[PDB]
Design an enzyme around this catalytic site. Sequence first.
Site, PDB file in Angstrom:
ATOM      1  N   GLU B 481      35.614  21.008  -0.722  1.00 41.31           N
ATOM      2  CA  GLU B 481      35.213  22.435  -0.793  1.00 41.31           C
ATOM      3  C   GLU B 481      33.878  22.774  -0.119  1.00 41.31           C
ATOM      4  O   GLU B 481      32.968  23.324  -0.745  1.00 41.31           O
ATOM      5  CB  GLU B 481      35.229  22.935  -2.250  1.00 41.31           C
ATOM      6  CG  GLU B 481      36.613  22.906  -2.893  1.00 41.31           C
ATOM      7  CD  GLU B 481      36.592  23.181  -4.386  1.00 41.31           C
ATOM      8  OE1 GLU B 481      35.688  22.656  -5.085  1.00 41.31           O
ATOM      9  OE2 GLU B 481      37.490  23.915  -4.859  1.00 41.31           O
ATOM     10  N   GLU B 550      44.726  17.471  -5.100  1.00 43.89           N
ATOM     11  CA  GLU B 550      44.591  17.879  -6.498  1.00 43.89           C
ATOM     12  C   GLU B 550      45.791  18.709  -6.909  1.00 43.89           C
ATOM     13  O   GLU B 550      46.163  19.641  -6.208  1.00 43.89           O
ATOM     14  CB  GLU B 550      43.324  18.695  -6.696  1.00 43.89           C
ATOM     15  CG  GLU B 550      42.057  17.964  -6.315  1.00 43.89           C
ATOM     16  CD  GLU B 550      40.831  18.838  -6.384  1.00 43.89           C
ATOM     17  OE1 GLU B 550      40.809  19.758  -7.229  1.00 43.89           O
ATOM     18  OE2 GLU B 550      39.889  18.601  -5.595  1.00 43.89           O
TER      19      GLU B 550
HETATM   20  O1  LIG Z   1      38.851  21.912 -12.310  1.00 41.63           O
HETATM   21  C1  LIG Z   1      38.470  22.651 -11.176  1.00 41.63           C
HETATM   22  C2  LIG Z   1      38.599  21.786  -9.927  1.00 41.63           C
HETATM   23  O2  LIG Z   1      38.952  22.654  -8.868  1.00 41.63           O
HETATM   24  C3  LIG Z   1      39.147  22.017  -7.610  1.00 41.63           C
HETATM   25  O3  LIG Z   1      39.413  22.999  -6.635  1.00 41.63           O
HETATM   26  C4  LIG Z   1      37.900  21.232  -7.166  1.00 41.63           C
HETATM   27  O4  LIG Z   1      38.122  20.500  -5.979  1.00 41.63           O
HETATM   28  C5  LIG Z   1      37.424  20.292  -8.270  1.00 41.63           C
HETATM   29  O5  LIG Z   1      36.207  19.697  -7.856  1.00 41.63           O
HETATM   30  C6  LIG Z   1      37.290  21.068  -9.590  1.00 41.63           C
HETATM   31  O6  LIG Z   1      36.275  22.046  -9.471  1.00 41.63           O
HETATM   32 MG   LIG Z   2      34.006  22.709  -6.901  1.00 44.68          MG
END
Ligand SMILES: OC[C@H]1O[C@@H](O)[C@H](O)[C@@H](O)[C@H]1O
Ligand SMILES: [Mg+2]
Lengths: 129, 1024, 121, 129
Positions: B481, B550
């Site tokens: 990000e 993710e």
């Molecule tokens: O639980 C929220 C998550 O959201 C994702 O987009 C991010 O890459 C993680 O670092 C964390 O912030």
């Molecule tokens: Mg983040």
Amino acid sequence: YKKVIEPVHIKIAHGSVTITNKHDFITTDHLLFIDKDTGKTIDVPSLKPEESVTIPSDTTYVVAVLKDDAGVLKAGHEIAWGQAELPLKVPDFVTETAEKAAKINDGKRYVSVESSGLHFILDKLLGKI
Amino acid sequence: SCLIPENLRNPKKVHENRLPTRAYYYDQDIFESLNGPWAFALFDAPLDAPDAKNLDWETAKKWSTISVPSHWELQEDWKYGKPIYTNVQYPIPIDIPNPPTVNPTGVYARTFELDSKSIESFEHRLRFEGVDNCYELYVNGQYVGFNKGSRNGAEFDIQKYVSEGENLVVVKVFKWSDSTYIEDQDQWWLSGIYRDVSLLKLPKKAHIEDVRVTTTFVDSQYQDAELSVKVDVQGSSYDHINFTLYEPEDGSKVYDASSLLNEENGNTTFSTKEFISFSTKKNEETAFKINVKAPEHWTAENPTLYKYQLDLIGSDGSVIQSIKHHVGFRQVELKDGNITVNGKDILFRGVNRHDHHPRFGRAVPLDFVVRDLILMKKFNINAVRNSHYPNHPKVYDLFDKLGFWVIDEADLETHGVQEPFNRHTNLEAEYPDTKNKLYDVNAHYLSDNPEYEVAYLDRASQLVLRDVNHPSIIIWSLGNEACYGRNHKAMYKLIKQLDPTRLVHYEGDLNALSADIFSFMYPTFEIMERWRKNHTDENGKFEKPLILCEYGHAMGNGPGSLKEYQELFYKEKFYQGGFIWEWANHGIEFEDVSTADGKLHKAYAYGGDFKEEVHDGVFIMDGLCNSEHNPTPGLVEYKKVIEPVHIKIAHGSVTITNKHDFITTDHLLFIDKDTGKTIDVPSLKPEESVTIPSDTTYVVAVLKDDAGVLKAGHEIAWGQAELPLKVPDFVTETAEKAAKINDGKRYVSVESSGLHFILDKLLGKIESLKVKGKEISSKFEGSSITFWRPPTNNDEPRDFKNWKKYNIDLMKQNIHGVSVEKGSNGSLAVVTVNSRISPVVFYYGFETVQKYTIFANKINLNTSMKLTGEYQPPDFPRVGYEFWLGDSYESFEWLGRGPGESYPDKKESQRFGLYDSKDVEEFVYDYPQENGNHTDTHFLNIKFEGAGKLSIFQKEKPFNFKISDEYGVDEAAHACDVKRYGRHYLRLDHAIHGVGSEACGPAVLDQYRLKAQDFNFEFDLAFE
Amino acid sequence: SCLIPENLRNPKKVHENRLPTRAYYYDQDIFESLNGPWAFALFDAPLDAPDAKNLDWETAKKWSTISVPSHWELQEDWKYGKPIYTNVQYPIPIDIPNPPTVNPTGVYARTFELDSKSIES
Amino acid sequence: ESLKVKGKEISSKFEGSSITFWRPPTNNDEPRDFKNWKKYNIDLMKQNIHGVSVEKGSNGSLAVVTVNSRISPVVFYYGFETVQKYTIFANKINLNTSMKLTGEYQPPDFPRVGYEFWLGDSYESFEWL
Ligand SMILES: OC[C@H]1O[C@@H](O)[C@H](O)[C@@H](O)[C@H]1O
Ligand SMILES: [Mg+2]
Ligand SMILES: [Mn+2]
Ligand code: NA
Ligand code: NA
Ligand code: NA
Ligand code: NA
Ligand code: NA
């Protein structure tokens, strides 16, 4: 156990703090003595094993604490303490004795006392509120 | 801006005098630990800190001590402040590249002893494994250098500054700098020397500086391989190098915490089983390439390693220095649009893992990391992403030995630049195919900022060069990000230049202009599917694959629909799986005053608990494991969906499909659980299957022998034949018994032998039902049929909002009429209740008919609910009854899914069986929410002390139930805040809303939503 | 809906036997005040309240008293509940014209004295 | 820290910044304006000092103290390049405040802008035109 075996005795009576070193070898020099009623330190002479000093003071509560990190203990760690005995003071609660009419019902089994802001019910059979 | 030091506000000042990054190798003979107690003082800002060029040990000596390694926000009594949690938002104002002027500065000091001979014998360095945020380093009152990069290491040459006797090390550590802007991970803000510090003693005249090991297959058929070893020796006084490669140890090797952590060498004879030797000659290149005959492949499923010893040899023929390590024969390629290892297009069964410990934070003892990884292996995981920074260098050997596909990620997140934009434009949602346009607008601040190039490159250089010799790392990642900009392209060029052997990942680069892989986070299936089709050409060819770096956000109760994601993974070659966010809740242990108790309790902190100015609340509590790193129902469910063997039982047959990438099924013992005898299953290769005829209902696939960190008998996979709902053969007493029926003014009474039934006509409430010594009654507040649940983390952003808006928690039952009649076909009485069930302030509700048919030993309850009125809610949390259980209540037993909780879109890991409440440890959520429901329940037995059981079942369809004594869950912030009644209740539900992953990701899928509609269901309450 | 009385769920039942409205004039000679303490009891709903056709003064006499005029949500110690504030939202479910079945019912009772001549005059 | 002139003392009432912008929201503020101000973190405005200049007095003044800073809330770009010039006389202090609004994503308005000072223990009353 930590209390009963504390290696320094601190006794507060008759406007005095009596401090006795109850270690076997070390002095009291590593300890900072705090008057807990004011938060300001008490200047205590270096006491050898079994030596004691009486210091006149208005204090109620004295703490003996470590000056600096030493061994596995941190600065401010409590080694010993003492308090002056606290008399039982009746709190200055104000009982409302003003003439207020009260509804009293002495029933067959239950007795009731109702007034403004008050409701008291007792079970006569049991002695139970 | 002279009140803030130049080096804290200069993005190009990445370090001063730091040695170039080299491949990490721990050596007991070279590494001397400087961990332990150090003198330490904290200052408001740099200007209050002492000039280290004048700081004596005599002066520093007098300070308090802190133990290294540790964070300074995690000390006894919070001596040096508390942790701060932010997700996106920076905890500072944005004025790139300036940090705040008020900038907590910690000064560390200790001494170490040096010998007369030591300075003659050795080049001396200092190595810091990690310091947050940045620091200057002094030895003996002299400035050595400066460093940035919190999760990267650093070495400094100390030889010039060193003296015989006492030596003084002083480290000035700063909390904020220009670097803070690129270190904005969704995690706790913590500071200090939080990783090892070491004194290195390298042989002076000549020593091994760097090593490079690659394994490349010569061939299209992945047999013979070229092992390349390149050594950079520093100094002249050496003759040549020796290399010894040893016979392999199969990936099935047994390990434990103890043997994984053993660091002994020197006199320990490394290995004996010599496979290949090689020697360099005097005055020749200290590098070589050798052809290796059909070596054993390294794989995450079978991490077979060849140990090696590399010796630097002097003129006299003695060993100046040795490196003892391992080779993993493996090769990663982008091949026909897939990520390929050894010619094979793999599947990530992955997880994102932060460095976190509930007491130590990011200062995680290796012991604990081992604990994490073993647990992962125990739950079928094969891949880890280092979100979002490199870990302690010693961790990577653990990946090598245990077998994980690893994404090693640069320490670089820039997320905070987005927050003002998000707020200014009232942005509600981001979507994986569309969101990069929102990051594009702010890229110029950092990722497209030429002033930050040196920093971005350094994060890249440092990432790759330290960890380049670990076979488990197959992908380098540019960070997380950080939008997309020129600096990312620069990072990509550098990495391919430094390490051509691996692939590059970066999710912020939507079109992979400077990445080798496509990557989404939390996409819907529609979004995954569009992407596939737009990147698959007419031939069916694709150029690059998609992973989900993710997905299935594991916050609280959930994630839902891991099933539907997995179906997609197996179906298309374009999808290569993903990594769950996240491994574990980041809870910090602290003392909370209880809302239930008025007393102090151990609890796990998230945002707000340490009273931050700005924080992101519960968003840190999003793991498959809890704060204490133990499995939640989320992890239990994940292990099932990702199981590497499929077992299907239908039509008198068991079909077994091997779903591994490389290994056969040969190491597994298949048991027919109905008989206990093993099933002879042929050796199945990846993707092979066999159908075996059998009468079985339930088959388990289990480990034959101890292998890796798993024990003989460990369950890898299982399958069941579907269980039809059988009506229990309870015998209803229909004999003619006279019954005393009293239809009073308000209360209706039905009394018979062994039976007492009282219903409040005004409320529709069972005042008391006492049958054969067993008592239940309505748990009543407003309605006899309730709809509410304590909102999950996933419920919070939308569904809860809707349910609250429509007053579902305030449903009222308004009784219209109660009908009372004498029994007919064996029944004692029929009591029919006619009512409207509707919340205050609203039109919508159910015209309800509750018919109680009362027998001597049974109560039949027929519920008809007809949804009426304008302005209806879309869905409900649940629908069902609540009963108080009598004092006699002791335990329960059920036929259904178990042993743990189950929900419509999170239930398949809980197999069918007969379960006893006594055999089950009830799961406690770190953040209190909906829990403990059991779905697809065939029947429920509730045991009463000395009075037998009450059997409950629903006609024609399985039901849902919870049994607890808990309340106040909604308002409870922590486990200790949960209130408890003096008796238990049964929550008896016809239906329940799914769980989803909407806290971050898709809503509960349509077929799992409890949609607003009519309800009709019949229950029997059968008393023994 | 027989568990809620007909007159509480009938919009047309605006009154029974009420005299037609006339211009108000207070006259000391005609108006005798019945304000003061009255016997009073609160019930969960109409069906718990006594049939007034059978309620004696001897029976009612024994109840607690409330002072008329006053609201029953504004008594010493909130004896009979507390005030409820809503702006727009109804504090009940909407099912026109039905009130909730649970419907607080207060019964008031007192006596007054009448002369032989009064009924004639 | 302290300003004591002819027996009278004042000092900054300081939490984050010497110039603050927040007020306790009115009932009218609640539905929109408060939402905006909270969104833009106006209650969390910080003063980050860049440089302080100190010089001897000139036209009758004793000293001139000039403060250069950015006044900006956490998490945001927007803020004021600020110059505070204190001209100190024997019986008077002249305070010249220059505030220059800078940065992307700005709030529409503020609740207020000004200084907060603690009054010394002697303080008894006030009078104003
Ligand atoms: O639980 C929220 C998550 O959201 C994702 O987009 C991010 O890459 C993680 O670092 C964390 O912030
Ligand atoms: Mg983040
Ligand atoms: Mn709590
Ligand atoms: Na953050
Ligand atoms: Na696939
Ligand atoms: Na999170
Ligand atoms: Na809660
Ligand atoms: Na109203």
